[PDB]
């Protein structure tokens, strides 16, 4: 009997004999969870859900689903004692974003779990007051069109990290060689995957010793100068730059002088040409003057920037063709991303193609599709039979035309909307 | 560098059906750097002037190379019978006099290997000539692929109902065979093969049955891949993925092993709390009997994560050991 | 930074000539017209109109690199016809076709609006 | 420097890498200057 601290456990439905104790009235009372005060704890306390830990879990005889496991048949086990609520609650927070993860190979679920932590998005709603160093905020994030049910609780419809691209899996001009992608330049001009990048610089006016006090003041050619460097003219007279000025590479942000005064001014981190966003002035714990300055830089996707799907492989952008160079459909739907076909097979990510197929059905149907892992009410045949109702090829192929010469492409291209993430990497962070 | 991009494509370009028209041919000859300004005579003059993929490729091939490879799917009963220099499936490559006469190219013919037309080019013609041969293959193939296009989609991963029934019956046979082996062990009719144990006897017998099931499903699937299938396009030119990858995508993921053995008994006498104690059936110890198109059940998903973390750890330890050995040698 | 301004895919800089002709020396009666600040729009129609002349044995175009904005059109005619005239006639016949197309579209419009 | 810009043989002018320079990343390549940032 353990009452220790640190035993990891998890809730499980109780199966007395061979019938769940979760009757229909518990569900009826939980539907009305507001204006009823019937919560989780009124379900625990009703002796219908238990917390089982990892060594109590070896004396139990779990079922995966009531609908199958405790139904009379040619008997496997008939002494079940617990039941899984949903078997997809075995997955963490970053693997609950992957759609159809029971169709990927586990190296891909692991890769994506690692890359869902690099996708830009909106990271928190009050980023307007937070002067973190290094924030990345997408302009137009979108919630996925093919989404897990475990994402309703991760608040991924409210701070989503990515955009639903139209993706064609096609060899177009060779600029999508191994993992590279071809981006639409017109989509990118229309706001696609644009980003903002904020950086904060702090400095404090410390008077540590008796002499040698640091002070904020416009240095340039004022009085008692020292080793004044390139440029000091955007500072205001309090030695701080003002919000709304455009700062370039090797440009001065805070005008600090450490007194016959040396200068210890603050410059931008080796070039970026941003715009000064916010200059807050305060006092630290010591009662010295303190200043945080946030500069803002817009980041339009480029030839180096890395994008990745929710099915775990990331690629730079090889080239960007405008809208008239892209392969179009007989409706004029040019892809947003063209990805290489020879990426898909080697990675077992059929979940990527099922995400495109379910996403096409969801965009046409006006729904948002269920990519929950262990569904069994969602096949590929059921998705195909709905895609063939909106007048498309049931397997998601589509006769594309060549944007350069206008001629059809002899093999029909697989195209559809897939949720793409803009990985935090890019290239603006290397050329400065 | 001849990556998958222009290897699948060169297997499709040199097929016997690739008839290029006059404007397409001129488009392609704009990207030959080593072209002498002469348009070859069409393979087909009447009714329509209509070149071939092997003509434009024989324009790429440098000098007067001679080579005889053998495409990947060559029936081995062909060289003996008639049609030995005819080859109804176009599986014997003969680059004679710098000029592809028959046979579909692949990486077996264009990689670097023994034979390997690019190797014979490096040996016979020179060293910048093979640089040009690489770059020419790439450019004219990229542009023909603008005309032809390559994709991968659902329906490449789907097999006709005949093959689904075949694979389901293969799996069901493997199930009931492991079931009868287990009943032997449980009634002591199993006699240990000389050398190891009775547990290792049972273990080897079961692993044998299950690996035979996985391989039979993989083959019975790849034998149903149509010629219009793009996974066949991927694999027969050896360009991308292994045929085991496509086997798992189409047929069966198969048995998951942690340190060479089936999934270990990690709870007390069972692999997960969902199974009965002392279950040696294939479902209990890690046999994933679904493809990635049908999707893995919750326990198969976990056993697959278990057995695919070994890959991730093996990768890291191998890169470390390999860098060490390389530096020590060097 | 290294972002080419968007207008330099169609705007000639000083000293660019917009077109140069090089005689191709591997074969007789072949020219190579390099046209600056053009793309497949103007290359593909000229090619497909040259391929309509019965005295043109080769017409082709290529965009050497997609990040540079220029095309190369290689023409090769029969000896009694120069590729400069084949090019000129292609452009004249395209201009004539588009003039016809413009007036036919004006008439089709003015009839659709039940004028 | 309107005065210093005269060159006569033997000087070493330290120019900017241009098309055709040979660089190494151990094999070597010929530089071609392209208009974007990778």
């Amino acid at each position: 009997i353990y009452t220790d601290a640190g035993r990891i456990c998890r809730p499980l439905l109780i199966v007395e004999k061979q019938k769940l104790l979760l009757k229909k009235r518990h569900i009826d009372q939980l539907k009305e969870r507001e204006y009823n005060n019937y919560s989780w704890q009124d379900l625990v306390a009703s002796g219908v859900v238990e917390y089982i830990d990892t060594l109590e879990e070896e004396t139990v005889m779990l079922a995966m689903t009531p609908d199958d496991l405790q139904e009379k048949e040619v008997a496997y086990c008939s002494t079940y004692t617990h039941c899984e609520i949903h078997p997809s609650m075995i997955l963490g927070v970053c693997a609950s974003i992957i759609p159809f993860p029971d169709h990927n190979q586990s190296p891909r679920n692991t890769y994506q779990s690692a890359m869902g932590k690099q996708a830009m998005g909106v990271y928190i709603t009050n980023f307007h007051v937070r002067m973190d160093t290094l924030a990345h905020v997408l302009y137009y994030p979108q919630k996925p069109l093919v989404t897990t049910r475990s994402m309703e609780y991760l608040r991924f419809r409210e701070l989503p990290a990515g955009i639903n691209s139209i993706v064609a899996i096609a060899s177009y001009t060779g600029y999508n060689q191994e993992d590279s992608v071809i981006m639409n330049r017109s989509a990118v001009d229309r706001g696609f995957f644009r980003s903002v990048f904020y950086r904060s610089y702090k400095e404090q006016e410390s008077k540590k010793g008796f002499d040698q006090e640091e002070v904020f003041e416009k240095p340039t050619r004022e009085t008692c100068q020292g080793m004044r460097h390139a440029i000091y003219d955007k500072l205001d007279d309090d030695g701080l730059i003002a919000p709304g000025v455009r700062v370039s590479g090797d440009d001065v942000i805070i005008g600090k002088t450490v007194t016959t005064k040396r200068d210890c001014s603050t410059f931008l981190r080796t070039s970026e040409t941003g715009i000064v966003d916010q200059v807050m002035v305060t006092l630290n714990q010591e009662g010295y003057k303190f200043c945080k300055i946030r500069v803002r830089s817009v980041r339009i996707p480029q030839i180096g920037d890395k994008f990745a799907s929710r099915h775990g492989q990331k690629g730079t952008c090889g080239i960007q063709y405008r809208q008239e160079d892209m392969p179009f459909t007989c409706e004029g739907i040019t892809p947003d991303i063209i990805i290489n076909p020879h990426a898909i097979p080697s990675r077992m990510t059929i979940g990527h193609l099922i995400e495109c197929l379910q996403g096409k059905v969801s965009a046409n149907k006006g729904e948002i599709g269920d990519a929950t892992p262990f569904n069994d009410a969602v096949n590929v045949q059921k998705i195909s039979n709905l895609l063939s109702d909106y007048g498309y090829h049931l397997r998601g192929n589509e006769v594309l035309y060549n944007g350069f010469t206008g001629r059809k492409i002899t093999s029909q291209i697989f195209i559809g909307p897939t949720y793409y993430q803009r990985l935090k990497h890019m290239v603006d962070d290397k050329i400065h | 560098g001849i990556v998958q991009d222009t290897l699948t494509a060169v297997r499709k370009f040199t097929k016997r059906d690739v008839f290029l028209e006059r404007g397409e041919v001129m488009n392609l000859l704009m990207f030959l750097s080593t072209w002498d300004g002469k348009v070859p005579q069409p393979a087909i003059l009447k009714p329509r002037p209509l070149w071939t993929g092997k003509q434009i490729f024989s324009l790429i091939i440098p000098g007067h190379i001679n080579c005889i490879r053998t495409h990947s799917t060559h029936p081995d009963d062909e060289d003996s019978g008639p049609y030995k220099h005819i080859s109804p499936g176009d599986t014997k490559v003969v680059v004679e006099n710098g000029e592809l006469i028959m046979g579909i190219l692949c990486k077996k013919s264009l990689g670097t290997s023994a034979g390997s037309l690019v190797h014979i080019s490096y040996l016979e013609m020179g060293h910048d000539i093979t640089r040009l041969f690489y770059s020419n293959i790439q450019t004219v193939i990229n542009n023909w692929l603008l005309i032809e296009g390559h994709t991968i989609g659902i329906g490449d991963s789907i097999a006709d109902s005949k093959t689904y029934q075949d694979i389901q019956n293969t799996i069901k046979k493997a199930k009931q065979d492991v079931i009868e082996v287990i009943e032997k062990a449980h009634n002591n009719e199993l006699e240990p093969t000389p050398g190891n144990t009775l547990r290792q006897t049972f273990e080897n017998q079961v692993n044998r049955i299950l690996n035979d099931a996985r391989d039979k499903t993989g083959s019975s699937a790849q034998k149903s891949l149509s010629e219009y299938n793009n996974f066949k396009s991927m694999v027969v030119s050896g360009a991308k993925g292994s045929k085991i990858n496509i086997s798992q995508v189409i047929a069966v993921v198969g048995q998951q092993n942690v340190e060479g053995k089936r999934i270990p008994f990690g709870f007390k006498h069972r692999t997960l709390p969902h199974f009965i104690k002392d279950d040696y059936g294939p479902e209990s110890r890690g046999f994933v009997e679904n493809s990635y198109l049908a999707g893995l059940t919750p326990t198969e998903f976990f056993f697959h994560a278990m057995g695919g973390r070994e890959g991730l750890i093996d990768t890291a330890v191998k890169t470390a050991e390999t860098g060490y050995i390389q530096r020590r040698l060097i | 930074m290294n972002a080419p301004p968007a207008f330099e895919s169609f705007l000639l800089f000083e000293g660019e000539k917009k077109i140069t002709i090089n005689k191709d020396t591997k074969v007789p009666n072949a020219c190579l017209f390099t046209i600056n600040k053009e793309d497949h729009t103007l290359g593909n129609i000229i090619k497909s109109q040259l391929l309509k002349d019965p005295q043109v044995l080769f017409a082709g175009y290529k965009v050497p690199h997609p990040l540079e904005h220029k095309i190369i059109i290689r023409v090769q005619t029969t000896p009694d016809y120069s590729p400069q005239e084949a090019f000129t006639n292609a452009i004249t016949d395209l201009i004539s076709e588009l003039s016809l197309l413009e007036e036919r579209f004006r008439v089709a419009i003015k009839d659709k609006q039940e004028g | 420097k309107p005065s210093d810009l005269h060159l006569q043989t033997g000087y070493k002018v330290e120019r900017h890498m241009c098309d055709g320079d040979i660089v190494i990343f151990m094999m070597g390549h010929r530089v071609r200057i392209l208009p974007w940032s990778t």
Binding site: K430 | - | N2, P64 | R30, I33, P35, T38
Partner: peptide, 25 residues
Amino acid sequence: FSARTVITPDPNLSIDQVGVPRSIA
């Protein structure tokens, strides 16, 4: 000694060339 930039593909270069931005150059 460059700014360790990314490497993207370019099938229009000769296999003996590298494409260098005008800022690395």
